[PDB]
Design a protein around this ligand. Structure first.
Ligand code: 8IL
Length: 282
C-alpha cells in the first residue's frame, strides 16, 4: 500500500489485489498477509528461483504484516474451465496445460519445494498458452504465523500424515486433470471425512494390499466402510487409454507408488503434446 495504486481485488492467507507500482507503472499481484529470519530468508531465495511454469515472486516486504508482490496474470484455470464448460477444453490444450504444470512441479520438487494446495483457481494462464503455478501453500512449512476447499487433497493428508511428500501435489494435479476432461470436480467433498469417503467410493477403500501402512495412519479407523473400487472407465470416460493410464498412476493411493512429475512427463500421453493458444475473454 501507498507505493501502489490498488486497481482491483482479485481474490481472498489473505487478500490479493491487482495493483500498479506508482513510479514504474508495473501492474502486479499484491498479496497482503496479516500475521522469522528463516521464513524471510527462505521466501527471499524464491525471487531468484524462476521457471516459466511458476508465478514470479517480485518482492517481499514485512512490517504485523507480510506483503508478497507477484507477477500479474489476467485469468486462472477455474475461470477458464467455467467459461469452457458447455464445449469443454480441447484435448490438445488439456494436454499442454497438464504437461506445463508437471514441468513446473518437477522444477520446484527438484528444489525440495512443495505446493501443497493446488486448485484450479491457483493456476494462472495467459494469452500465449502458458499456465503457471501460483498461491503456494508455503506459510506453515516456512514458519509464517498467519471455508477451505478439500477437493484436491491427497488421501495421506486427510488421514493425518504429518510429513507430506512431493506426491501430494501429483494427486491434486491428477484431480485437476480429471476435472478438465469431464468438466465436473472429481472428488467434491465438504468435510475431511466426506472428502475421504468420496475418494473411497470411487477408488475403493484402501488397504494394506494397495497401500502398505495405511491402517497405521494417524486418522485411519478400522470402522471405515469397505467400498469396492469402481471400474476406472467410469471415471474420466471419454479419455483415451494413454490419458486414463497416466491418471491412474497420478491417483495411486500409496504415495510411494504415485508417479513423479518427472516420470509423468515421459508418459506416452505426452508424445504428441503441442502448445495451443486458448480463447481468452479478458
Ligand atoms: O504463492 C504464494 O502465495 C507464496 C506464499 C509464501 C508464504 F506464504 F510463505 F509467504 C511463500 C512463497 C509463495 N510463492 C512462491 C512462488 C515461487 C517463486 N519461485 C518459486 C520456486 C519454487 C517454488 C515456488 C516459487
Amino acid at each position: 500500500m501507498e507505493n501502489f495504486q490498488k486497481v482491483e481485488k482479485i481474490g481472498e492467507y489473505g487478500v490479493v489485489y491487482k495493483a500498479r507500482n506508482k513510479l514504474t507503472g508495473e501492474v502486479v499481484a499484491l498479496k497482503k498477509i496479516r500475521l522469522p529470519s528463516t521464513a524471510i530468508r527462505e521466501i527471499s531465495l524464491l525471487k531468484e528461483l524462476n521457471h516459466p511454469n511458476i508465478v514470479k515472486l517480485l518482492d517481499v516486504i514485512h512490517t504485523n504484516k507480510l506483503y508478497l508482490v507477484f507477477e500479474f496474470l489476467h485469468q486462472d484455470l477455474k475461470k477458464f474451465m467455467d467459461a469452457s464448460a458447455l464445449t469443454g477444453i480441447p484435448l490438445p490444450l488439456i494436454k499442454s496445460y497438464l504437461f506445463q504444470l508437471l514441468q513446473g512441479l518437477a522444477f520446484c520438487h527438484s528444489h525440495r519445494v512443495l505446493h501443497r494446495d493446488l486448485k484450479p483457481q491457483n493456476l494462472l494462464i495467459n494469452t500465449e498458452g502458458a499456465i503457471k503455478l501460483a498461491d503456494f501453500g508455503l506459510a506453515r512449512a516456512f514458519g509464517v504465523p498467519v471455508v477451505v476447499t478439500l477437493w484436491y487433497r491427497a488421501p495421506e493428508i486427510l488421514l493425518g500424515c504429518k510429513y507430506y511428500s512431493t506426491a501430494v501435489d501429483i494427486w491434486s494435479l491428477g484431480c485437476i486433470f480429471a476435472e478438465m476432461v469431464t468438466r465436473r470436480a472429481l472428488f467434491p467433498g465438504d468435510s475431511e471425512i466426506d472428502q475421504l469417503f468420496r475418494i473411497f467410493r470411487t477408488l475403493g477403500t484402501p488397504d494394506e494390499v494397495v497401500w502398505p501402512g495405511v491402517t497405521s495412519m494417524p486418522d485411519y479407523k478400522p470402522s471405515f466402510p469397505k467400498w469396492a473400487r469402481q471400474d476406472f472407465s467410469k471415471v474420466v470416460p471419454p479419455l483415451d487409454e494413454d490419458g486414463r493410464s497416466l491418471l491412474s498412476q497420478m491417483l495411486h493411493y500409496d504415495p510411494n507408488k504415485r508417479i513423479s512429475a518427472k516420470a509423468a512427463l515421459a508418459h506416452p500421453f505426452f508424445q504428441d503434446v503441442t502448445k495451443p493458444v486458448p480463447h481468452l475473454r479478458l
